[PDB]
Amino acid sequence: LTLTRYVMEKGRQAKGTGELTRLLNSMLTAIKAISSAVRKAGLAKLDVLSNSLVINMLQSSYSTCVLVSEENKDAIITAKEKRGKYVVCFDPLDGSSNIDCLASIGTIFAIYRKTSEDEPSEKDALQCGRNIVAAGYALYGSATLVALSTGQGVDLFMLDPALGEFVLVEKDVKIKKKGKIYSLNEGYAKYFDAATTEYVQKKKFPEDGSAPYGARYVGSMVADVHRTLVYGGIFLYPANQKSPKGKLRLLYECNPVAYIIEQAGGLATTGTQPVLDVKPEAIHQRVPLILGSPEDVQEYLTCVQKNQ
Amino acid sequence: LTLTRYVMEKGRQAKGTGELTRLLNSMLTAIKAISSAVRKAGLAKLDVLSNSLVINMLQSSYSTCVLVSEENKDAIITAKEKRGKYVVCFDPLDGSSNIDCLASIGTIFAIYRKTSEDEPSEKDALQCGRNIVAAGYALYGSATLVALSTGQGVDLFMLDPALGEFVLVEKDVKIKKKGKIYSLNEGYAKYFDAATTEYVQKKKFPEDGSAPYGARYVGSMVADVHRTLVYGGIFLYPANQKSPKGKLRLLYECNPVAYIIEQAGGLATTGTQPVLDVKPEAIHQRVPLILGSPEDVQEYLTCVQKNQ
Amino acid sequence: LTLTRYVMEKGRQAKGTGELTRLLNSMLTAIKAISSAVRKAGLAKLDVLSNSLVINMLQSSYSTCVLVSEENKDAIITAKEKRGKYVVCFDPLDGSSNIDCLASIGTIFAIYRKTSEDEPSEKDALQCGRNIVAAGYALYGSATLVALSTGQGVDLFMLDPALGEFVLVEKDVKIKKKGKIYSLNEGYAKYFDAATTEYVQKKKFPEDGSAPYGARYVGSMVADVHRTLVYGGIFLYPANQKSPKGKLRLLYECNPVAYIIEQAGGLATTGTQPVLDVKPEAIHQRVPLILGSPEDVQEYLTCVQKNQ
Amino acid sequence: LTLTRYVMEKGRQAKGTGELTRLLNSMLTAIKAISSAVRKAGLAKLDVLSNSLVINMLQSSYSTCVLVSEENKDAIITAKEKRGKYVVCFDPLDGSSNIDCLASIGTIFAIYRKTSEDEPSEKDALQCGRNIVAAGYALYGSATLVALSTGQGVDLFMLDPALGEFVLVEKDVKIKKKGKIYSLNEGYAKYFDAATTEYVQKKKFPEDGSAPYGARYVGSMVADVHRTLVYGGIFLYPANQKSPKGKLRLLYECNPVAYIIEQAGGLATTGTQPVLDVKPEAIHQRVPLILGSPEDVQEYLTCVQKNQ
């Protein structure tokens, strides 16, 4: 049950013209190339390579009109000759600070349909995450995994290195209602707002006699978010004094993972509203991100409410 | 400059009989098999498989007399017919809690020469880490890496998946004198001793106007220790109220990484003495572990001194 | 320029509904699995495995109604629930006698559209090769190659083991007008007809002072035919006293390679008519096969004419 | 039961100083690199690359004094600083005419000990094949295989692409006493001597009512010789009018395969004496080669005797 076969079958079921199917295949081919490069990087700038692979694969798919990448200042408008209806926002390599120590790193993407009647522009990439058509990530960890949703839940696929294809390993994954792990960079504690300080105190010093949550923070958002999906708990990169609007990027970091987490029955908030409901105003806009098991995110939101 | 060629060349230089060379090759062959299994695990109990691979490879090398594994209650005495002079302590798969979320995991080992004149027994595995002949780890991360020392510094090798061999990527690596990352499970904060609480407070709320250290904690000791080696900083798993003697295991977790870190110019302490100077009293003995950049470990030791 | 991307792009250009595209992808996925098994066969009945992979991949593609395999006595009718419009004739593993000595082996296939209005049956697989929609082969040699035509010439793709995908290496390949290699099992010389004896004598003892042709015969038809395509010359498995109708099978050996060779500007004959014009009367029908560079096949046909 | 472990174990049993063991490992590492290059050649002069890999690997092993390669006019004398006792004759890539059509190709080698007391020179590479210390070949076919003998029979190993190591698949292989396949380029029939013409006639037109032998000729000597080993029969590249001393090269083609075939219980002759007994007079000397199942080679020798 390979990913390409799965994607083509889902396309058949959806009665699609093949356009999204070609796009997804092109994205996944880029991911396979990136995986191979990551697995031999030290022997063989990974941002630049990954970015080129994704842009070229996507543009040549005849399915795109606008791309937004972390690595490009401006939106990339597809040549008229190759122009299709989809807009792709992506982070070609997430976790760059973890490349050299061989920690898990990733690729993140969200796909939208152009709905405007205008000439294609950056504005077509400023849709709310609620309008996502498909989104997901690749995790280049101890094994290579893709999480993908096209709106009917989250499916996990793993690269079979012998076969050279991604194979379905879990269909329609659901996050636990409550976890026992909290994940954030506590090195920013001095800069936290009151709500974040209070929540973290609740995790480490519970007042109901429960065991403190365990702490984990890989420092690669895709790795920490994937763990949150499969083990439950909470991941936070809130606003702080040094990053008053948060650090993570709305279009190509936060919206894709918020989509996956919500699809799996979790929550993803800025602290004031769901990430997927934020209307983007600029392509490299930052937002706070708190996501994971719904009961844990709900508890964080109570801390925000109590301190507002 | 492949690992097997490198190991055989080092053997030639050492005027060895070939015994340690055969042992190291056998260990590294087990590591390659484990890597392959890890990279396809979700599709294809990893503790049990890895343990069997290592025991079989080591015993059949004709270089061992005693093995200690995390996965075996008692020391494993090699059959007389296959008996050599070396004692190997190993953790066949480190980071088991991180297997399912695809975070970096590893294999850890230390090799000793039997120095007693007695029949081989568990006592031959109770040498201080100072007596290590060779030690190191494999990290199954975004790429596969081996760190190895035979007493002349730390060398890093990376698996070339196309060639099917480990290749030298860095010779004689040295840790930074001081880093900017601290790494420990802060979920145990409620249970910390005063020295640990004070040190962590110093990292998050410096009193000299310096920037707080960043926090990272993968939760797989090999991954966190490897990051500490290549980026600098400090890794801690101190004793706490729930684990009054620490959690990590002296023979096959702490001594091997202490050896690597000291070889790279770092420090590794229990809080009261160097890990490598602890005389083991039992094969599955636990010890506290604080290691990394020497100035950072020295600062931790000042906190211990101040609170004793 | 990967095969999956290439096939999807050709589908887009053809304005296809995606049905043939899904079929081709499914076939090529089976080929990748077979390649992997072949490359580790001695360590790890290859007919049975390959056959199962192909049948399962094809049926689950929702693109087929009838399959004919060398390994199945009767045509395989696709379940109504999974039924599409295409008929696939295939040899899941060609060159079985060469498996154990590690010579090049292969997979061969031809795809037809069902044109009858009747319930699907073996009769839908009895079209002349002229009615082929797509055909080709995989060659599991020193590298893994696919030759594929959908009617616009022959394209060659090679498996990149690092990427895990087939990549285009040659577009629209054309056979040489005349070659210098002849390829047949001369162990059947005692049983040859007069025309074959005369032709072979002309190749070994030319009467115009030209150099004799070189002889090559791997004994795996896909390997010998592929060499004929890329180097030129002639390949023969004519009728003989022991095999009066030839040995090779019309539906899933001869028609697919005849299609590739004709598409590349060569000829493929039974000795009396083009292979592609033979009307099949039974699914496992045998025919004589003589193919390759047009001037060489034309010379063979002159020998047939002269001896009729 | 991996090749490196096997070679080191055989070294231990032989009480070797490790010198031959290091040499063999270096040769086998070159073979693994060549295999990888061959498997991706079309995408990625193969003679030149393979030659460089072998020379560099061998020289840096500290085990050699003299190398002879097909690709170098003169013997290559190892720098005094890296000088060991062994002489290696090799064909870094055998079957160059078959590279582009993806037929099986190979690497061939024979190892000798320097026995002279003189400064090392080409003369040290002019030993008779009887003096071989170790010899064998790699076959880059549908899978990758090494045949190796160090004087205690022929062992076959196959590359496990997942593990990245050669694994033992057959120990102490013996050729059949008589086969049913004959293998030679019959395109040279016009130039054959009387004995070769008579023998080939006996294979195609037996005079005792037996079935004619089947014909096979890949045209890559390593592939044809390997088939001869595992299936039995006979392989010939005799002298002919265009090549009065034969075509194949004594030092690095004929002696290595003659050694393997004799070790497996077969015969290898020039037509007048065993190949292994020929005293080489020049490093690129050619000899006729007829080898395989002993009863078949004996029959060929009767034809030589009858026509002398």
Ligand SMILES: Nc1ncnc2c1ncn2[C@@H]1O[C@H](COP(=O)(O)O)[C@@H](O)[C@H]1O
């Ligand atoms: N491969 C696929 N998987 C899931 N949904 C799809 C797929 N292809 C198309 N769809 C759905 O059908 C719509 C139209 O597809 P298309 O005609 O390819 O643009 C898309 O926007 C998706 O919502």
Ligand SMILES: Nc1ncnc2c1ncn2[C@@H]1O[C@H](COP(=O)(O)O)[C@@H](O)[C@H]1O
């Ligand atoms: N491959 C090697 N690399 C580094 N040191 C070695 C190697 N082989 C042997 N030695 C050193 O030489 C000693 C004796 O080797 P052996 O005779 O193989 O037990 C070992 O305990 C090591 O200290």
Ligand SMILES: Nc1ncnc2c1ncn2[C@@H]1O[C@H](COP(=O)(O)O)[C@@H](O)[C@H]1O
């Ligand atoms: N991927 C493709 N490559 C080449 N030709 C195609 C492809 N898909 C469809 N076609 C052509 O279009 C016809 C209809 O395609 P379909 O609607 O998928 O059955 C096929 O029978 C082919 O002749």
Ligand SMILES: Nc1ncnc2c1ncn2[C@@H]1O[C@H](COP(=O)(O)O)[C@@H](O)[C@H]1O
């Ligand atoms: N790995 C090995 N396998 C088989 N025979 C070996 C091996 N190593 C050494 N020998 C035999 O022992 C001799 C001396 O080995 P060395 O001291 O390494 O030159 C060689 O010439 C071989 O005949």
Ligand SMILES: O=[P-]([O-])[O-]
């Ligand atoms: O590491 P990142 O900024 O995608």
Ligand SMILES: O=[P-]([O-])[O-]
């Ligand atoms: O995960 P660990 O106990 O080696």
Ligand SMILES: O=[P-]([O-])[O-]
């Ligand atoms: O070897 P074959 O009968 O496909």
Ligand SMILES: O=[P-]([O-])[O-]
């Ligand atoms: O193809 P060859 O001359 O080794």
Ligand SMILES: [Cl-]
């Ligand atoms: Cl990680």
Ligand SMILES: [Cl-]
């Ligand atoms: Cl072949």
Ligand SMILES: [Mg+2]
């Ligand atoms: Mg990035």
Ligand SMILES: [Mg+2]
């Ligand atoms: Mg990122």
Ligand SMILES: [Mg+2]
């Ligand atoms: Mg970045």
Ligand SMILES: [Mg+2]
């Ligand atoms: Mg463990």
Ligand SMILES: [Mg+2]
């Ligand atoms: Mg452990």
Ligand SMILES: [Mg+2]
């Ligand atoms: Mg454990």
